[PDB]
Design an enzyme around this catalytic site. Structure first.
Site, short mmCIF file in Angstrom:
data_model
loop_
_atom_site.label_atom_id
_atom_site.label_comp_id
_atom_site.label_asym_id
_atom_site.label_seq_id
_atom_site.Cartn_x
_atom_site.Cartn_y
_atom_site.Cartn_z
N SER A 12 0.84 -1.19 0.00
CA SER A 12 0.00 0.00 0.00
C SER A 12 0.88 1.25 0.00
CB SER A 12 -0.93 -0.03 1.21
OG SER A 12 -0.16 -0.02 2.40
N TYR B 276 -2.28 -0.27 8.37
CA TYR B 276 -1.63 -0.33 7.08
C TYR B 276 -0.15 -0.62 7.19
CZ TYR B 276 -5.88 1.09 4.72
OH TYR B 276 -7.17 1.13 4.22
#
Lengths: 209, 213, 219, 231
Positions: B128, B133
């Site tokens: 990403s 994340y």
């Protein structure tokens, strides 16, 4: 097409055998105007003869500072502007010699040629590290030099990257590498396609830890 | 002929827009036989049609383990062997780990069996571009490095690409190079990693981010 | 005195054996008020009995989220605030069960951490220390994920004087030796001493780091 | 008695100011016998007087190789063996090439020269600690620092089997005369780089050096501790 270096001027040091030679050939096959550096004039001309056109040969002792500056001034004039520099030459007295040849020579030659690149807002600097403790120091220093320089000139569209080769002719791949595999990586880094990649080290070593 | 992917079978996940579509289009340009996965079947066929030669399209829910195994089985069978795979508050945690780490590892595990049998393969993970994340991204990188060690003896390489900012402007202040990247730049790096010419490069992460710290 | 944890409340997970127990004993010796987590209640009592005073015992399955939330709830109440969290907790097929390795080795630590930083943030003081695991591909992935979590969380709460660090042990006494330059395996206490250092007031400026304690192993 | 250095002999370079002095005081508080190297002979004697016992004082130019070798010989003889070496000394139209050579000589070569002089005796005793404090125009310094770290990691492999650890500490922004001078915008620019929103203090580096020097850190080698408030 893709990853072509058509019309770009590249100076490759230590172009006499091994990895430097393979880089030289590969750059030429991709359409670069190549300048070969070494200390063996006879072995260089042999390579330039093998390739043919768009090849220049230069001699210089990269252990001597004035000689490094002379190389820069002359290759830049005769090649008419250098786009891509590939620092590939390498090998108490022992410590000094390794630092001189494996670290200081690259940084000297790099600082001579970056000004023109900075004016043109375009360039590629690619440092090939050596394949024990003195070598590790110089190698880690070259990588640190490279990352800091990358930050300094990033806004001028100049990239600065290193390639760290493994065992080239305890490797999970169970084979040694060949010089052309280093060369292919150098073409990638040198290409316009790798414009956004900077401050990096590609370790090309078969999965070594 | 350098960096060509002629005749190689490649499965690209998330091919429906952005970086995935750019990778699919670049692979096709380099002679690859391309499998496109996504969730938007109409978009997938629009892209497939636009390419117009040797394309496969696959739908699957990457949040579902059994669905991932099915995609692997069907893609490997229809394409006759895949050479290249490009993997592209508590509820939030589980969903990010499921889609940004677990999906890539599950699909990779399913497809390496046949790559190992052919002693040839490329695995390329696109991370990403927040703490969920970052966990998923670092896990994926750690997964990639560990797997590279596992299967290096079968001439399968496993690498990651970590993109920076891809196309107010306090973002531009964060980037030393002072421009955002474009998706094709990730695509070019994927082509390099997928090529025969990157056969000795494994367990690496390409940080393509204009010099971001 | 230097590196003391006098008065600090510490929760140590997986405290019934090995590294966990060593951390707890070393914490107690340095003046910390210690809360032991584990599954085997009897082992918890045996360790607690050895340390004597200033010891709490909690049992909970770290495999259930609600159970992790309950542990955070109970421990924070009974100990009256927790300053230091040590995330240590690590035939059924276990190693090749990606979902399970991720659940126990990454998600559990992140769930417990997130239940407990709340009060640390309010107090503007705390310490999160994650002990990573010592099949292998799944563990590496969970470990790298944990280090990533810790580094990102460290950035978020640094301004609140909470540090977040990991310790990655090498081969620890519970071919091999050819990989360790120091030509010995580590012992649990050595991980314990690193945990004391990180937990101390003296390590207030060190955050987002991993101490690899492994006798000089590569990668 | 955890993390005590009682009776261990430690040589600390650059010990007249900042981090070096904080390391020396911290070591002495933990029971170490400390050798203070610096250039200001009088500032060294002041520190030694303040500490009061089990302190030795040395001068040497760390840009001269023979002078580094001499320091090693005379320190080892006077102190009757050195167990801990803390390489702290450094620096923070000019001839740019000379500046490159000087930064490498002082921030990389000096540490490797002194270390190589002192590890022989440590290897004989099968015990020792090497701790390199890296530096805090930046490109020359980054190269030297990266080089020192790479030197340390390699050496650590070489001598791990003799129970000598080799580690680095890389400080972030640490308070000093220099940082004290920063104006408002310079200061605010630096704070924005530091998640913890404060500068460290020299004693924070010292505490880490105590940790690495201790018997408790015997299994920790080849590492760099970045003490930088999250930077």
């Amino acid at each position: 097409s893709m990853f072509k270096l058509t019309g770009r001027k590249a100076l490759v040091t230590g172009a006499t055998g091994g990895i430097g030679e393979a880089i030289a050939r590969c750059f030429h096959a991709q359409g670069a105007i190549v300048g070969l550096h070494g200390t063996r004039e006879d072995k260089l001309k042999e390579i330039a003869a093998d390739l043919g056109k768009d090849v220049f040969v230069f001699s210089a002792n990269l252990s001597d500072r004035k000689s490094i500056k002379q190389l820069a001034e002359v290759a830049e004039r005769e090649m008419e502007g250098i786009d891509i520099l590939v620092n590939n030459a390498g090998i108490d007295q022992d410590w000094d010699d390794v630092l001189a040849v494996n670290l200081t020579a690259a940084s000297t030659l790099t600082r001579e040629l970056i000004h023109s690149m900075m004016r043109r807002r375009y360039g590629r600097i690619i440092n090939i590290t050596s394949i024990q403790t003195n070598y590790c120091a110089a190698k880690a220093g070259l990588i640190g030099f490279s990352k800091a320089l990358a930050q300094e000139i990033a806004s001028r569209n100049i990239t600065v990257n290193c390639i760290a080769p493994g065992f080239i002719k305890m490797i999970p791949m169970k084979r040694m590498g060949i010089g052309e595999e280093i060369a292919f990586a150098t073409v990638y880094l040198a290409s316009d396609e790798a414009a956004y990649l900077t401050g990096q080290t590609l370790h090309i070593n078969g999965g070594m830890a």
